[PDB]
Amino acid sequence: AKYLPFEGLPVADTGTLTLSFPGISGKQKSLLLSLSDIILHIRYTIRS
Amino acid sequence: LAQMEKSYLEKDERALEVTRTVSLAEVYAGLTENSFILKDKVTELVNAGEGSAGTTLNGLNVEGTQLQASLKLSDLNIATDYPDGLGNTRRIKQISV
Amino acid sequence: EGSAGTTLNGLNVEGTQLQASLKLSDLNIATDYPDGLGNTRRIKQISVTLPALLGPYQDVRAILSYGGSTMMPRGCKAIAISHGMNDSGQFQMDFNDAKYLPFEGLPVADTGTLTLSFPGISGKQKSLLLSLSDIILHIRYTIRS
Amino acid sequence: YDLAVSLCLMAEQTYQYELNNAAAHFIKPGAWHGTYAGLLAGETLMLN
């Protein structure tokens, strides 16, 4: 009933999608060191 | 209200719900301008907490204690993944990481 | 460049779009059961299974389209195959939906053209089309008296 | 009256699609009698 996040964004827009990790040197240092790659599940909707 | 409701009921069609899984390492490798390998740039920027990666709007940057990875959505060619005979209002439904 | 088989029951490459056609009248669906159980045999819902070797976090780009002249209320005319494994286009596909499901109410014994078109035959979906085993549809239909 | 007869025609089209019968005409033409300024139009549409 409410809007989902990132709903209705035009998929062909000139936006900036930023994934920010707080604490690069803190407790998330080994987790960032063990990161393989970044993968997004962008689901979009085409409508006529 | 009844005018707007009848217009919504007359102009509402079903969908075309397309999930597109995007790997950022592929985009960072096929950047064609200061392209890089993501798994090496992350350990470079973690063990040296100063640098960035690639150009602006399409790469990593360390800001204080906040490693942030950027991406420009126009450079992913999502609206041209299908023919345009199926609709132009191609809006993002939902994103998960 | 080439095609496969006759028209309406085979493949064709159109530019960069490999499309596979199918005529629904040639599948003899309405005569799979005795006719004492109802004649209004309409398609409820269709999902596509492509048991191919998909890459890691790799998408399929395909459109299950309909060709014909029925009513077919709205944008329920076609779905987009992105999951590739027993899916409609819908995230969390739900029967008893208030809205109409896609391909709902199509007469199962009609002379329509069911076309599955793959965008980018030579592009990034070249190896995926090379690794395709076969095409399998989950056509669910409803007989009513 | 225009909006509600459009909604009733929407529901009639829905019924004719669901029950596979294109001849089920349930909304009678009329029901806006202009000489009585179209009164009881809601009564006729509720009946239909």
The angle that helices D2-18 and B2-11 make with each other, rounded to 10 degrees, is 30
CA C81 to chain centre: 9
Chain B residues with CB under 8 Å of A6 CB are 92, 94-95
Q: Considering only CA atoms, which of B63, B50, B4, B52 is closest in space to residue B28? A: B52
The rounded distance, in Å, linking the Cα atoms of C33 and C24 is 16
By the CB < 8 Å criterion, does B69 face chain A? Answer: yes
User: Does residue C16 belong to the interface with chain B, where contact is any CB pair within 8 Å?
Assistant: no
How far apart CA D44 and CA D48 sit, in angstroms, is: 6
- Alpha-carbon distance of D27 to D9, in angstroms, equals 7
Phi and psi at D2, nearest 5°, equal -60, -45
Give the whole-angstrom CA distance, residue A29 versus residue D7: 60
B-C contacts (CB, under 8 Å): 52
Q: Which of C69, A45, D30, C30 is nearest to B95 (CA)?
A: A45
Sign of CA dihedral C51, C53, C58, C59: negative
How many C-beta atoms lie closer than 10 Å to residue C80's C-beta? 27
CB C106 within 8 A of CB C112: yes
Q: Resolution of the experimental model in angstroms, please?
A: 3.7
- Contact D/A (≥3 CB pairs under 8 Å): no
CB of A13 closer than 8 Å to CB of B55: no
Rounded Cα–Cα distance for residues C110 and C25 (Å): 5
With beta carbons less than 8 A apart as the criterion, state whether B58 and B71 touch.
yes
The shortest C-alpha distance from C68 to chain D (Å) reads 16
- Is A28 exposed, middle or buried, given 0-12, 13-18 or 19+ CB atoms closer than 10 A? middle
Under DSSP, the state recorded for B78 is -
Count of CA atoms in the C-beta half-sphere (13 A) of C29: 21
CA C109, CA C42: separation in Å to the nearest integer? 8
Is there a contact between A15 and B91 (Cβ–Cβ < 8 Å)?
no
CB C54 within 8 A of CB B19: no
Query: Which residue of chain B has the CA closest to D2?
Result: B3
How was it solved? cryo-EM
